[PDB]
Amino acid sequence: GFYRQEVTKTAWEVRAVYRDLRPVGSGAYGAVCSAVDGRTGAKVAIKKLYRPFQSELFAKRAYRELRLLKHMRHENVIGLLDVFTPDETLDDFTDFYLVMPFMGTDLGKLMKHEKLGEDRIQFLVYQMLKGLRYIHAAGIIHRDLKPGNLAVNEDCELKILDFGLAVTRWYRAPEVILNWMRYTQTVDIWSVGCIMAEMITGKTLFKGSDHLDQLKEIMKVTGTPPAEFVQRLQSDEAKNYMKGLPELEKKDFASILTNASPLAVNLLEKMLVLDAEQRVTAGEALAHPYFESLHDTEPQVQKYDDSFDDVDRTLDEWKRVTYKEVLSF
């Protein structure tokens, strides 16, 4: 009395090298399939961009994603193995595909599926910080680091995803919630801290309903910042808001993270401070004694020039520049 049917029937056109296409995930900007590279035999992930040239905004974002992926060459940062288009000429150019190493899962699902002891947590945070140090050395800020953006394979190797293209705010720095200061690289550090805390205790550290509730939950732990920090804020609304907050003392992280080693508590105390200038950088965090047991952790990477991304272009010009990028691979 019933019949089965596939309802989403999207069509892919990929190089003959990649065999065994299998869906993995979807997204607003593209869909991902697993495949096997016939040459090396390695497992790869192929992302088909979702209508990249339906609008000038989508085209700009696809071009920036492509250039960011081409620029980064680090083991803890997702990179490009290949880029291709099935279209034969520029006038027919409508779809292009990105090829990346295949990661079995992301840290978000892993936190609910797997036991994460001290050693695996240490290694994962270690890889996060190395990838972040590489990204920051290139002058790029992730700005939206979360467990879903951290891919992990079977070897506990980690890669950062969706960087520079800026669930939503439990891992956002306080300067991102209120937009009260110019963003620095250390915003990503805050995210790591949150993630690391959630890795240790198994509970979201700062889980708020609305934005102001997020800041309430944050300052319950960090305490109110000194008035001097409030006077250096750029936003006037945030300044007036922080003025009228009742005084709150800093809570001891050992009481918060009851099942954390002293070194973990120390590193987290240096990561989760309200003033971004007082936060350790990725390199300083990597030098913490918490990572002493791991092999030593500057990257020589060219500064990323975003001027080419900000050139005002028509859709035809976006298609031509993206086509050149695709063919230049």
UniProtKB/Swiss-Prot annotation:
Highly expressed in skeletal muscle and heart. Its cofactor is Mg(2+). InterPro entries: Kinase-like_dom_sf, MAP_kinase, MAP_kinase_CS, MAPK12, MAPK_p38-like, Prot_kinase_dom, Protein_kinase_ATP_BS. It is an enzyme of class 2 (transferase). One of its GO terms (cellular component) is nucleus. It comes from the Eukaryota. Keywords: ATP-binding, Cell cycle, Cytoplasm, Kinase, Magnesium, Metal-binding, Mitochondrion, Nucleotide-binding, Nucleus, Phosphoprotein, Serine/threonine-protein kinase, Stress response, Transcription, Transcription regulation, Transferase, Ubl conjugation. Binds 2 magnesium ions. PANTHER family: MITOGEN-ACTIVATED PROTEIN KINASE (PTHR24055). This is Mitogen-activated protein kinase 12. It comes from Homo sapiens.
